[PDB]
Design a protein around this ligand. Structure first.
Ligand SMILES: COc1cc2cc(c1Cl)N(C)C(=O)C[C@H](OC(=O)c1ccc(CCN=[N+]=[N-])cc1)[C@]1(C)O[C@H]1[C@H](C)[C@@H]1C[C@@](O)(NC(=O)O1)[C@H](OC)/C=C/C=C(\C)C2
Ligand SMILES: Nc1nc2c(ncn2[C@@H]2O[C@H](COP(=O)(O)OP(=O)(O)OP(=O)(O)O)[C@@H](O)[C@H]2O)c(=O)[nH]1
Ligand SMILES: Nc1nc2c(ncn2[C@@H]2O[C@H](COP(=O)(O)OP(=O)(O)O)[C@@H](O)[C@H]2O)c(=O)[nH]1
Ligand SMILES: [Ca+2]
Ligand SMILES: [Mg+2]
Ligand SMILES: [Mg+2]
Lengths: 69, 426, 440
């Protein structure tokens, strides 16, 4: 009986620690996955904007080339 | 403090921008000298959204004035509130755009854009927590359309997590004789669809029709049209400038109004519209939903509402406002999409605008806005099939393919509005 | 010992917190400066009201509370308001930019920047407790902070405090006072994320409270102030067992034993009576039987639903004021023979009763009449799932077109979180059907 009483309270401790552990891990995964997703969306936005700047450099180049002709 | 940085570019943008600052300065009790002389603490509670505070208890508009010619900005400085703007915030060129979007976007505008960004950066660095930006400009000209959309993209690169809002004046042959305005407007819409979060479509076509048909003005001046613009701009910024619960900042407004990122072009409305020489809550509500009161030449009964913001100003029964807003939705349920429940939000501000006991301002995201874009696309393709005056644009470095891309992207926008107009819940 | 820490999140949670703590001070005789002349033990003590108030050496009685909001304007009113001297400045935490009605910003983009400071401040309250019992968390479903930051906080509290009890007072959205089109999204997201971290949640349907103020108090267009005064009376009824002592007093945890048959089935329906104006209460004394009968009128529920169309799994009656068991038992016997009270077959049918003798109080300038006796019924009925069904239907209408979803994805969220949250709500609705089916 004493052995069973020890196993019950050890079970209660193990379940509580596993609940804490899994909650900590799930939240770490979500915050890291969210951080990467948002950073990727911002990177795509700036990449499109930089391509517009690249296009503007090509336009001003095209004007200078036809002026030399 | 949630600051907004205001930018006005080109002749139209600086003109409607100056009237905006005149109207809201009077509303907040600010005189041309920048001193406060109001009588209500509600005038100053959110004053920092649009005004910087300086030495001597003086309030300075957080405004930046841009143009490729000094003409309009000299007359601004000679205006009634001309001495209230920060002198260093005047950024002007000498060449001019000449109604050429290419010069504004790629050539003359690109040579001045960095000096404008230095002023934007200065005003943004001193903000407690910057909300974003509002830009006033026209799409039919050269500077406001070309350089204005260039400024949006460059500012977007340095403030990508901030809200970009524009008051964009749509061209109409009823107002301006310039025949290449469909070019400049389409090229601008190509940029606004990608780089702004919310755009108020101020349609010169609607402004002329209101002045002529409703206000009985045989010869509407730009001052007559701008009176409607200033009253509209005051109404759609009321929730940003006075204490309130609904749409109190640019981002909450966008989250309530924009269900899909590209569909961010709003149909403004105002009530009452009465001529100088000629009101209940039910009448005020019915008029703000009437097509004759829309600042965009579109009939909302030709489409469906995705989202609506309504703003009532003045002392009135909030119970009656609630009943009338419920009544107009129930009686017109066909014109509101059923797959966005509770898509109409209502705000009530106790302070009425100057000269009115009660007023209502309407902000609609309606699929009927495609009528405005179809009108521009029809005038665009009639010019582009003849390639009229293309050499002015290609002479700056552009080519016809960029014109084709702008036309297709705007045509896609129309197709997308029609898609969600046709969508159903079941 | 048995301290309770209150956490008020976002505008709704903060403003309801204002109304609750003002009411507590009036109930206990605490002045706006924190002084309590009736408290003869200076600087501490183990009285019942010490579960909610700590004490300083200077005799100030300080709420065991943290107020958190991602923008400052609401909490700034607390900092300059009538009860500003009640709170230490560190108990009031603000950011500069709110969640813009976006769960993703409350849980991630903005909330992550302040979550560590909030937990540190909660830890300072917990360290002053000799036997902390748990937390009470007040928040809206619809706001970006109330939804997103609360769920983040609840997740972190499970990690830092293990299985210490966490109860919610949750504001369920209503179109009459709602401020965002995407509130069904935020509601489903926070309900899914918080479900495993909450031991008990009292939902407050703003439309139910709105209707009660209009119908019972004759308020033409109720404001948040009208709503929160009524809400605070319900909150006070529920927490009175923790804050007062009495022979017939029954601890909230004892009601909780009966109210929660399975971990996920932890949403009691609250019904409160009497709600009556001063003009109508004059020369009109409402007996124990009359206020008890009103608990089974659906118009008096805190959540709109029809219990007469569901099955009961628990019925608790929390009385306060001039109430003795004899009158309670007589009233209950009358109701059992005249009402649609059907229990599930695996549950005992007896009503669980508690009585606190301290009479109800009203805030000066309010609309509620001062009455000699009041009652809050807490029932566990399958009918509360009707509130989930209404929210889930609005969610489905918008999500089928992915309307507004780009605002959440842009802040780092994925569509898989929406479907995962919606599937959890589908299983919850299914759980409420299953517990109501009779045994084989
Ligand atoms: C029968 O054919 C017509 C002949 C003309 C105008 C029109 C028409 Cl139909 N019409 C009524 C038009 O609407 C066409 C547009 O005219 C204008 O924008 C314009 C602007 C100011 C003035 C004031 C007088 N100055 N003059 N001469 C006149 C016309 C035009 C060519 O498409 C724009 C260009 C993209 C723009 C022009 C420009 O302004 N700059 C720039 O780089 O490109 C350039 O340089 C000053 C001015 C050119 C003026 C002409 C070629 C005259
Ligand atoms: N009962 C009650 N409901 C409120 C109150 N304030 C806001 N609400 C409701 O809460 C929802 C909006 O959420 P808020 O709490 O205002 O938003 P928030 O938590 O501050 O989150 P963000 O502002 O987006 O950062 C709507 O359903 C409102 O009706 C209040 O004082 N009392
Ligand atoms: N409503 C209104 N429209 C204007 C005003 N000024 C110019 N516009 C419109 O703007 C277009 C011309 O663009 P403009 O601003 O002059 O070009 P820019 O100065 O080079 O940017 C035309 O379609 C005009 O109808 C104004 O004060 N009010
Ligand atoms: Ca004491
Ligand atoms: Mg001009
Ligand atoms: Mg808030």
């Amino acid at each position: 009986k004493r052995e069973h009483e020890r196993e019950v309270i050890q079970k209660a401790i193990e379940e509580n620690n596993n609940f804490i552990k899994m909650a900590k891990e799930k939240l770490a995964q979500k915050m890291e996955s969210n951080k990467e997703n948002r950073e990727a969306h911002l990177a795509a936005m700036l990449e499109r904007l930089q391509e517009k700047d690249k296009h503007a450099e090509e336009v001003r180049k095209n004007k200078e080339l036809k002026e030399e002709a | 403090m949630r600051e907004i940085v205001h930018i006005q570019a080109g002749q139209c943008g600086n003109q409607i921008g100056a009237k905006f600052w005149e109207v809201i300065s009077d509303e907040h009790g600010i005189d041309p000298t920048g001193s406060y002389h109001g009588d209500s603490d509600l005038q100053l509670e959110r004053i920092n959204v649009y005004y910087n505070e300086a030495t001597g208890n003086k309030y300075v508009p957080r405004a930046i004035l841009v143009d490729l010619e000094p003409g309009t900005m000299d007359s601004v400085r000679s205006g009634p509130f001309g001495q209230i703007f920060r002198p260093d915030n005047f950024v002007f060129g000498q060449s001019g755009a000449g109604n050429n979007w290419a010069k504004g976007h790629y050539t003359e505008g690109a040579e001045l854009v960095d000096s404008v960004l230095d002023v934007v950066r200065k005003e943004s660095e001193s903000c407690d927590c910057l909300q974003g930006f509002q830009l006033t400009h026209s799409l039919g000209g050269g500077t406001g359309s070309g350089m204005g959309t260039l400024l949006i993209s460059k500012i977007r690169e340095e403030y990508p997590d901030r809200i970009m809002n524009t008051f964009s004046v749509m061209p109409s042959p009823k107002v301006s004789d310039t025949v290449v305005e469909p070019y400049n407007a389409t090229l601008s819409v190509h940029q606004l669809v990608e780089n702004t979060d919310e755009t108020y479509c101020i349609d010169n076509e609607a402004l002329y029709d209101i002045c002529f048909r409703t206000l009985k003005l045989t010869t509407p001046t730009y001052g007559d049209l701008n009176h409607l613009v200033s009253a509209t701009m005051s109404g759609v910024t009321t929730c940003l400038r006075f204490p309130g619960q609904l749409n109190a900042d640019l981002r909450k407004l966008a989250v309530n109004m924009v269900p899909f990122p590209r569909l961010h072009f709003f149909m403004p409305g105002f009530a009452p519209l009465t001529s100088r020489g000629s009101l209940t809550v039910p009448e005020l509500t019915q008029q703000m939903f009437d097509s004759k009161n829309m600042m965009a030449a579109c009939d909302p009964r030709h489409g469906r509402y995705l989202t609506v913001a309504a703003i009532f100003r003045g002392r009135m029964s909030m119970k009656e406002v609630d009943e009338q807003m419920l009544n107009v939705q129930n009686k017109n349920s066909s014109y509101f999409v059923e797959w966005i429940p509770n898509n109409v939000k209502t705000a009530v501000c106790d302070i009425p605008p100057r000269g009115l006991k009660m007023s209502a301002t309407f902000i609609g995201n309606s699929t009927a806005i495609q009528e405005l874009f179809k009108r521009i696309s029809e005038q665009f393709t009639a010019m582009f099939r003849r390639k009229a005056f293309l050499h002015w644009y290609t002479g700056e470095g552009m080519d016809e393919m960029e014109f084709t891309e702008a036309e297709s992207n705007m045509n896609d926008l129309v197709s997308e509005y029609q898609q969600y107009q046709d969508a159903t819940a079941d | 010992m048995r301290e309770c820490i209150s956490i008020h999140v976002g505008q709704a949670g903060v403003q309801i917190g204002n109304a609750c703590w003002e009411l507590y001070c009036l109930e206990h005789g605490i002045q706006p400066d924190g002084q309590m002349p009736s408290d003869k033990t200076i600087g501490g003590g183990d009285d019942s009201f010490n579960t909610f108030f700590s004490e300083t050496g200077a005799g100030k009685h300080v709420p065991r509370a943290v107020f958190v909001d991602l923008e400052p304007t609401v909490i700034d009113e607390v900092r300059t308001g009538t009860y500003r001297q009640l709170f230490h400045p560190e108990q009031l935490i603000t950011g500069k930019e709110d969640a813009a009605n976006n769960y993703a910003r409350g849980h991630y983009t903005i909330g992550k920047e302040i979550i560590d400071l909030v937990l540190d401040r909660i830890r300072k309250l917990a360290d002053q407790c000799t036997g902390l019992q748990g937390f009470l968390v007040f928040h809206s479903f619809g706001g970006g902070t109330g939804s997103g930051f609360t769920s983040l906080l609840m997740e972190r509290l499970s990690v830092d405090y293990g299985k210490k009890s966490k109860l919610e007072f949750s504001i369920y959205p209503a179109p009459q006072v709602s401020t965002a089109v995407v509130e069904p999204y935020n509601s489903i997201l926070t309900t899914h994320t918080t479900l495993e971290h909450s031991d008990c949640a009292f939902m407050v349907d703003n439309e139910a409270i709105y209707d009660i103020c209009r119908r019972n108090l004759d308020i033409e267009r109720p404001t948040y102030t009208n709503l929160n005064r009524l809400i605070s009376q319900i909150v006070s009824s529920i927490t009175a067992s923790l804050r007062f002592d009495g022979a017939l007093n029954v601890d909230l945890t004892e009601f909780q034993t009966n109210l929660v048959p399975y971990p996920r089935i932890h949403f009691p329906l609250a019904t409160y009576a009497p709600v009556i104006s001063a003009e109508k209460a004059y020369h009109e004394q409402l007996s124990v039987a009359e206020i008890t009968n009103a608990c089974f009128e659906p118009a008096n529920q805190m959540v709109k639903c029809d219990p007469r169309h569901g099955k009961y799994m628990a019925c608790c009656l929390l009385y306060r004021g001039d109430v003795v068991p004899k009158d309670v038992n007589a009233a209950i016997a009358t109701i059992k023979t005249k009402r649609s009270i059907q229990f599930v077959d695996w549950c005992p049918t007896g009503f669980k009763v508690g009585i606190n003798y301290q009479p109800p109080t009203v805030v000066p300038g309010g609309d509620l009449a001062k009455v000699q006796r009041a009652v809050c019924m807490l029932s566990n009925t399958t009918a509360i799932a009707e509130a989930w069904a209404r929210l889930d239907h609005k969610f489905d209408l918008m999500y089928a077109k992915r309307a507004f979803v780009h605002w959440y994805v842009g802040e780092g969220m994925e569509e898989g979180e929406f479907s995962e949250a919606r599937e959890d709500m589908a299983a919850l609705e299914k759980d409420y059907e299953e517990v109501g089916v009779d045994s084989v």
